[PDB]
Amino acid sequence: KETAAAKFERQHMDSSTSAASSSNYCNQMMKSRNLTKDRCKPVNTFVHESLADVQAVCSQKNVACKNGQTNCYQSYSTMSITDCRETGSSKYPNCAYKTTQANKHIIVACEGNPYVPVHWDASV
């Protein structure tokens, strides 16, 4: 089984690009990160910053998680991100996503030792 930290990395990290430069970015990334294997993940956000920068968020601003937990942290600075969301023309196995690039503060839940991101809460 995948560790929580490893799953977060696979689902949300894309430091190889500064930003989504194409409307097909999500279709490509959702497939390659294996998020459309047995069903199309409805929603998923990728962050375009170094892994170190994202991990560093765990020692930044502590804010409440949407679920009420208190182990969430909000990035001090905005980060380049790309939100991927299924379009009305999406139907497994032919998943289809809308690609929305933006620069926003990230909010993640952190846990463990080392204390790292294990869940994507939201972006602002």
Specify the CATH number for the domain of residue 117: 3.10.130.10
Residue 85 assigned ligand-binding role: yes
In the three-class reduction of DSSP (H, G, I as helix; E, B as strand; rest coil), residue 15 is classed as coil
| Helices marked H in the chain | 4-12, 25-32, 51-55
**Whole-angstrom distance between the N-terminal and C-terminal Cα of the chain?**
31
Exactly one of 8, 12, 75, 101 is catalytic; which is it? 12
Exactly one of 13, 119, 121, 123 is catalytic; which is it? 119
Establish whether 12 is a catalytic residue.
yes
Structure determined by: X-ray
Residues in the chain: 124
Q: What's the token pair of residue 84?
A: 């991927």
Residue 39 assigned ligand-binding role: no
Instruction: Judge contact between 82 and 25, C-beta under 8 A.
Output: yes
Establish whether 48 is a catalytic residue.
no
Residue 31 assigned ligand-binding role: no
Question: What are residue 108's DSSP bridge partners?
Answer: 73, 120
Q: What's the token pair of residue 52?
A: 């170190």
Instruction: Judge contact between 84 and 43, C-beta under 8 A.
Output: yes
Domain that holds residue 38: 1-124
Residue 66 assigned ligand-binding role: yes
Residue in this structure with the two tokens 């999406």, named with its chain if needed:
90
Distance CA 68, CA 51 (A): 26
Question: What are residue 61's DSSP bridge partners?
Answer: 74
Residue 43 assigned ligand-binding role: yes
Resolution of the determined structure in angstroms stands at: 1.4
Instruction: Judge contact between 13 and 51, C-beta under 8 A.
Output: yes
Based on the structure, what is the number of domains in the chain?
1
- With b for 16 or more beta-carbon neighbours within 10 A and e for fewer, the 11-23 pattern comes to bbbbeeeeebeee
